[PDB]
Amino acid sequence: YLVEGDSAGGSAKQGRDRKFQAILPLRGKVINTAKAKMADILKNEEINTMIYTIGAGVGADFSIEDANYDKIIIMTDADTDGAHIQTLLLTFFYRYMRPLVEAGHVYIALPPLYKMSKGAYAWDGELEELRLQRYKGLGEMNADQLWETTMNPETRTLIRVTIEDLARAERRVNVLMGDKVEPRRKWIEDNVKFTLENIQNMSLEDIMGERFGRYSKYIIQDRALPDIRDGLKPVQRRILYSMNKDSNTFDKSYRKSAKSVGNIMGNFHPHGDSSIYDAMVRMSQNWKNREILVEMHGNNGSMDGDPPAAMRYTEARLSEIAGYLLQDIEKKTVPFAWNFDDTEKEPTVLPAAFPNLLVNGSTGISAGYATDIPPHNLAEVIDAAVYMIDHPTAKIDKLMEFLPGPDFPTGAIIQGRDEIKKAYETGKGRVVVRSKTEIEKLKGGKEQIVITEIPYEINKANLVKKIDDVRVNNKVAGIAEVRDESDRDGLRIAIELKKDANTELVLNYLFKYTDLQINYNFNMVAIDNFTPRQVGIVPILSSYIAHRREVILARSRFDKEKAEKRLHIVEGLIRVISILDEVIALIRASENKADAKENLKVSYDFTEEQAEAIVTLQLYRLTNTDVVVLQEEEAELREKIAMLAAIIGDERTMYNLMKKELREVKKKFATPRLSSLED
Amino acid sequence: YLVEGDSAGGSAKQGRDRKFQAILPLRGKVINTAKAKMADILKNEEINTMIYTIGAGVGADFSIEDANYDKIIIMTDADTDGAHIQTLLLTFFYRYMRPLVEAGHVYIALPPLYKMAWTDGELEELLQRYKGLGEMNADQLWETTMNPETRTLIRVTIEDLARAERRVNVLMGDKVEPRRKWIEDNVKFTSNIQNMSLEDIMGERFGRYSKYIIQDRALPDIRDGLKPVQRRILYSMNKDSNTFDKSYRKSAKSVGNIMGNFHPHGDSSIYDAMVRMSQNWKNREILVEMHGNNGSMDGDPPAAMRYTEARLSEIAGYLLQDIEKKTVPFAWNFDDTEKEPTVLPAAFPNLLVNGSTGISAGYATDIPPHNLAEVIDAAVYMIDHPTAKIDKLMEFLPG
Amino acid sequence: REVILARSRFDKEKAEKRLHIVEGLIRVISILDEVIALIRASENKADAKENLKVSYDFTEEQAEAIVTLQLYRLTNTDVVVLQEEEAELREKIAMLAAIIGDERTMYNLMKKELREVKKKFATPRLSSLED
DNA sequence: GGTAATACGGTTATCCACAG
DNA sequence: CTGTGGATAACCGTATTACC
Ligand SMILES: [Mg+2]
Ligand SMILES: [Mg+2]
């Protein structure tokens, strides 16, 4: 039994029949033995101990008859990453112990993902025909459960891999697991449906099919790529939503991170506290995000790349603009959905009162797709969205009057306008990004280059170091000293030169051969209707706009319905201030809460709503009985209800609402450019 | 600047003036240079890194003139484990680099523990608690502790050599008895550069560590039988209504709660405690029911906290009986955000039933488990026989 | 001991605040028709309570209790029922004060609850003893 | 030379795309 | 061959008492 990690190894070792069943635990994900050379492939711990533990040799030196076991069962967890491993491993026994695979000795264990409580297991159709707990991994199952449901011969089911049409198998392991992304992506497009989908043999091709498809789809939709609307990946949305639900906002205390992480992993995000804290930290670093979404107290990283305080230390809390990412989430504005567990519902997208995806950016490594979208200036983005609200048909050159190019939080200089255009047109382009520098004439007569902004996502330490590395290797002459002078109130790298040293030469060699100047490649993929799309500035801005339409609309309906309800109650309270002594003597007349409501409804034609309201009143209320205040309430109610009705009804009314709010956000948060542009 | 690990090393590194200040991160507790073989003290990685960084040579080969720095500043987190590291480092300097401590070159840094304040006498005269330097932002660190203008630094000196070799060798010595004596004696359980003798620094510091590690960690309370971590676990679990009669709950949530609301320490320690509390070959009457992998008598590691769910057991219910009905002393927590009980109602005698074990400083504890029945027998007998002698009691509590 | 005591002091104090409130409630049913009317023109909640006190010798506990009664509860006017509650409360307050005053009733309870726990949870011996 | 249990620290290898 | 960021999985140094 091949098992991932030692915690699953525990459940296995304890559930197993110890006479004829072994367990080999595996640290992590297994090496892709179709993507790396036989060099690394043979120098790999897991691989090696796997060859050993099976004892029959790899490659052409493999003997089916020297094999220590009859069956080689891959029992990974039931989840996505489980499936991906079933893949990687299946593509190692195909590429290196093929006779094992061909002879029908590699099987795949089918443990369950869920379980019921009445107070019945779950492999979607018998969980309905028999009348929850999602298993993170094996180690969440108790040993007897593992045994009776998956490890026991008399009871278990097993999928039995067999190579049926050899050549086709070869083709498939090649598309899916090989080095060239292209055919893998075509395969996904052609096969994966992003909307919405004892012993028993399946072919290598089919098994590899389902498992990779499952991995691919989940990892595209639900991990790596952002939503084209709110611009967030699942983990970031879940962080914002859970923190906000817990009242941890900008206007209150800070709060110890590891509580937050514990909750986020308790309620929304079934993965390591590692990934969660990591994401939460990144959201707090003003040199990674252009507009930060989380404020953190304490060591939260730095441009040198030093580790943030481990999560036991650092206080955190939502920023202010994040609130604007979640405004009106309470007014039924956005699609919710059950979490992994079914304890709670969670949002699938946020209202997003500002256009995040273009402002903060996204990056970006999925499977078959990968995204890279630079940040922009909140002002400029809003300006374009607002022009496009009045001008659906707008062309790129025009919009670029408002959206000239990216605005990195790390400043610098961006060269390449035709390519910024190319990328806003198509989603893909290449641009150059160059550091800010002054030249500094020092005492004596020696010049000194002072770098003061560096390229986006460049490690400052690494850089300074790779420059001193140019010095001591005399890759060019000039550099007398290289010294990081950065501090509390600035970023300053002083490259001091010798007397007589071509400063222009040194500078150019530096831009050429170090990361003082790099390329940014746009690759703007986002999830737009459940499938990945490569998009220019237009489907992004459009998508945004229509989102805000839907949000505003559902909001206006929620408020209007609320309003109506209230109006319909006051309409009762007034017409019961009239027949008061009668209604009191009637509730006193009645017998028990239901007879009182039924009687309030029979004897004076109140509704359920109005009945419950009146009967559920308090005695101290009866003191104040002024119908003029109620009438003012009723009136205001009516005017509101009307303007709501107007927003829901009239289109241009709603688009102006959109623009007013947007211009309000812009006014509040507008910050000046940091990245200068050059053509 | 000697700092305790890379988390605090961050803030150190940032908030520092780079022209003259250096930062050496140490990875944990420093080795005790009194208790260890010279084989070990030789091989110890951090020891070597310090002996090179200070660049002067150890002990007998120590040349004061070759000191790369005028001041060697000790900056540990403000809490107790802090003071204990201060202690270990200090004895190392006393031992294998004496004339540095003799010249007054070894200074101790003074970070604040809380805010709105040092100590606990001046804070009461007025609220976050810095559980390690890594949740202090760099500006704060500079202003409060690293700025040669603003800061305050304890300035360690050997003021009477004879009266020093004793204290170090007693508080750090291999032999326990003299330490225990010292503790029983001195520990009561209930300014730009200030100078202080080694005797008094090592004194007050080891006093702090010892007192905390005895009172609030390693030894159990003679009434509910719990060490504090176990107590916050049962209390918090029960507050969230994570009880025996209601569907297990991802431990990894419970632990975040415990760390943020009650137990300001590393997840590791907390989850490990909760799990041991679920293992029925360690506990005679388990207090936590846990679901999934939670170890074996072979010791295979429990599933990590991401995996297993848990709830209180039924009988833990009784350990918590009537807690709501103002039946037990509460106190504020590390935050001053919430109240936690200081001892539980204990509707059975847990200290004898599940036992305890058992390592602090000067004291260790080993009390083996017993039968819940038999202990309850003896308890009832004693209730009607205040003066009961051991031999009669053993007719109920054989062993 | 300390626990059983303080627990008992808690249970008593609660039973008593209740008792007090129910006696109040009974009296309110007696003079019931003008309670309403006195509130009905009494400026506000505050002056409603003030007017209940400075006119009917009510207590603030009974006052806030009355004036914030739900309207649908003016259905239930059953006096004998509230009187039965009054009975049970009195018996409880008795027992509890007994525990607090008789340092022998208390210890007997202690024994009671301890043996209760024994029947609920006792399991057999496991490590055998040899000398 | 070993382990006991509650504390203090930190670290590494994998997949995925896409760049020079 | 390196780094990007959201995922998988492990790993081990130190203190403290105590006893062969
Ligand atoms: Mg370059
Ligand atoms: Mg690169």
Residue numbers in the entry:
A (entry chain A): 430 to 548, 556 to 559, 561 to 568, 577 to 642, 1003 to 1484
B (entry chain B): 430 to 545, 558 to 567, 577 to 640, 1002 to 1210
C (entry chain B): 1354 to 1484
Manuscript text:
First, to prevent subunit dissociation and generate a stabilized complex, we engineered a catalytically active fusion protein comprising the full-length ParE and breakage-reunion ParC55 domain. Second, we used an alternative gate-DNA, namely, a 34mer DNA duplex comprising the plasmid V-site, which we have shown is also strongly cleaved by pneumococcal topo IV (Arnoldi ref). Co-crystallization of the fusion protein with a 2.2-fold excess of V-site DNA yielded a crystal structure in space group P42212 with the best resolution of 3.7 Å. This new structure reveals a novel (ParE-ParC55)2 dimer complex bound to two DNA molecules and adopting the open clamp conformation (open ParE N-gate; closed G and C gates). The DNA bound at the G-gate is bent and uncleaved and adopts an A-form conformation immediately at the scission sequence while retaining B-form on the flanks for drug-free DNA complexes of ParC55 with ParE30 (19). By contrast, the second DNA molecule links each of four complexes together within the crystal lattice by binding to the long helices of the C-gate via ParC R468, K464, N461 and H196 residues and is entirely in the linear unbent B-form. The presence of a second DNA-binding site on ParC has not been reported previously, and its unveiling is most likely a consequence of the higher ratio of DNA used in the crystallization conditions. The complex was crystallized in the absence of ATP and reveals novel aspects of the open N-gate conformation. The two N-terminal ParE ATPase domains (residues 1–399 shown in red in Figure 3) (that dimerize on ATP binding to close the N-gate) are located far apart fully exposing the G-segment (in green) to the solvent from above. In our structure, the ATP binding site is empty and covered by the neighbouring α-helix from the same ParE monomer, plausibly protecting it from ATP binding before T-segment capture, a feature not previously observed in other crystal structures of the ATPase domains of ParE and GyrB dimers. The link is mobile and poorly ordered, so its exact fold is not evident from the crystallographic data.
